[PDB]
C-alpha cells in the first residue's frame, strides 16, 4: 500500500546519497532474546522488543520470509474439510524459484502435503523454475499459492479422500495411508481423536464468500 512505496522510495533515496559516513554499530543495537513474558515472540527485523524512539536507516532485506499456501484435507468427524496451510521459509533475496521449492519441501512438517510434485504460482499463473524472485517482484506481502498434481482432479470423487461416513473403507485400504493412521475402529481412549465440526454448523449450505439465502 502506502507503506511499501514510502519505505521503498526512502531506501532508494538513501542509496543515492553521495555523502554518508555510515552507521555506528554501538548506536545501532540488535534485538534481545530476553524480555518479560513467557511466550517467545518473533517480530519484524526493523522492530525491537524494547522501546526505540528513533527511526533506523532503511536496510535491504537479505532474508525474505516467503509464505507458500497449500490445500489440506482435514478430517473432522462429520466428513472431510478443505482448508489452507501456510508454510513459511526464509529465502535469500537473490534465490531461484527452484531453490524456493527445495526450501519449502524441507520446511514442511506435515505428512500430508508434499507427496507429489507441486508448482508455485501467483494469482494462478505458474512461475519459471528458472528465474529470480527479483524479476517476479516477490516480497513478503506477495501472495504465493502452490498447486499439486492431482489438484485439478479434486472435483471428482476419486482423488478426493473417502470419508467412512459415506464410503466403504476396506482391508485393502485399512493398512494404507491416512486411513491406516486414523484408526477408524474406536478404541477406549478413542485413538487419535480428530477435531469435529457437526453437520448443521453452516446450515444446509456449506461455507461461502457470498450469502446464498
Amino acid at each position: 500500500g502506502h507503506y511499501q512505496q514510502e519505505a521503498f522510495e526512502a531506501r532508494k533515496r538513501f542509496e543515492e546519497s553521495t555523502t554518508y559516513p555510515g552507521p555506528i554499530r554501538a548506536a545501532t543495537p540488535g534485538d534481545t532474546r530476553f524480555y518479560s513474558g513467557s511466550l517467545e515472540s518473533i517480530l519484524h527485523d526493523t522492530d525491537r522488543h524494547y522501546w526505540r524512539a528513533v527511526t533506523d536507516d532503511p536496510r535491504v532485506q537479505h532474508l525474505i520470509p516467503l509464505r507458500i499456501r497449500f490445500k489440506i484435507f482435514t478430517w473432522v468427524t462429520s466428513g472431510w474439510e478443505q482448508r489452507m496451510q501456510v508454510v513459511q521459509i526464509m529465502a535469500p533475496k537473490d534465490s531461484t524459484i527452484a531453490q524456493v521449492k527445495d526450501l519449502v519441501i524441507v520446511e514442511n512438517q506435515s505428512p500430508y502435503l508434499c507427496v507429489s510434485s507441486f508448482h508455485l504460482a501467483i494469482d494462478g499463473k505458474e512461475l519459471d523454475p528458472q528465474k529470480t524472485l527479483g524479476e517476479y517482484g516477490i516480497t513478503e506481502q506477495s501472495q504465493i499459492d502452490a498447486i499439486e498434481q492431482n489438484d485439478h482432479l479434486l472435483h471428482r470423487d476419486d482423488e478426493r479422500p473417502r470419508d467412512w461416513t459415506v464410503d466403504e473403507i476396506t482391508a485393502e485400504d485399512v493398512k494404507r495411508s491416512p486411513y491406516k493412521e486414523m484408526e477408524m475402529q474406536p478404541l477406549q481412549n478413542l485413538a487419535p481423536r480428530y477435531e469435529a465440526r457437526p453437520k448443521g454448523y453452516f446450515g444446509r449450505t456449506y461455507y461461502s464468500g457470498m450469502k446464498q439465502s
Binding site: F34, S38, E40
Partner: protein, 190 residues
C-alpha cells in the same frame, strides 16, 4: 464490640457507633496430639513427629519475614522483587547455563535482627563467557527452559586466574575433596 466485657453485651448483630467489627476465633482450644505410632517404628527415615506441629507460613513463630532491604535493593531499583540479583557462578556443566549462588535477607522481628540465606539459580549465558567463580549480575526474564528464568546481564568481576587455568587445559577450579556427608563409616585404605 471487642472492647465490651462479657456481661456488658446486649446485641450481637452490629456496632453501635464505630470501631472494628471483630469475629472471635477461639484461640484456646486445648488442641491435642493423637499418638498413632510406636516409638520404635515411625514411618519415616529422617524425622519423627511426636507432638502437635505448628503450622502456617508467616503465622509461624518466631516470625521470619521477607526483607526487601539488603545489598541487592541497595544497589538496584527493581521493577519487581527479585528482578536483579548479584551472585557468584558455581559450576558450569550445562551448555549455555551458569549456576549462580545468591544471598537474600530474612528479618526476625522478635529479636529484631536479620539473617542472610542463600539460593541457587540457573542463568542463561549465551556465548559461554562465565567461568566458575565469576561475580555476575543476573536478571529476570522470559521463561527459557523448565528451570531457567534468569539471564546473565553483566560480568562484574571475571575470574582471571580461572580463565588462565582453563587456557592451560586444566579445570577452572579443583573438584571438592569430599562430597555430601554420610551416616556410614567408609573404610577404604590405600
Amino acid at each position: 464490640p471487642w472492647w465490651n466485657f462479657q456481661t456488658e453485651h446486649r446485641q450481637r448483630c452490629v456496632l453501635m457507633y464505630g470501631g472494628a467489627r471483630t469475629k472471635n476465633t477461639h484461640n484456646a482450644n486445648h488442641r491435642v496430639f493423637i499418638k498413632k505410632y510406636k516409638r520404635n517404628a515411625f514411618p519415616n527415615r529422617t524425622r519423627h513427629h511426636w507432638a502437635v506441629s505448628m503450622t502456617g507460613v508467616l503465622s509461624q513463630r518466631p516470625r521470619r519475614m521477607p526483607w526487601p532491604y539488603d545489598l541487592t535493593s541497595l544497589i538496584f531499583n527493581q521493577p519487581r522483587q527479585g528482578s536483579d540479583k548479584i551472585g557468584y557462578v558455581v559450576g558450569t556443566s550445562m551448555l549455555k547455563t551458569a549456576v549462580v549462588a545468591t544471598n537474600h535477607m530474612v528479618y526476625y522481628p522478635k529479636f529484631n535482627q536479620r539473617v542472610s540465606r542463600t539460593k541457587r539459580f540457573f542463568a542463561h549465558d549465551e556465548d559461554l563467557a562465565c567461568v566458575e567463580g565469576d561475580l555476575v549480575h543476573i536478571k529476570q526474564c522470559r521463561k527459557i527452559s523448565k528451570y531457567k528464568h534468569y539471564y546473565v546481564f553483566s560480568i562484574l568481576e571475571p575470574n582471571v586466574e580461572g580463565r588462565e587455568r582453563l587456557k592451560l587445559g586444566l579445570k577452572a577450579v579443583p573438584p571438592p575433596l569430599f562430597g555430601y556427608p554420610v551416616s556410614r563409616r567408609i573404610v577404604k585404605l590405600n
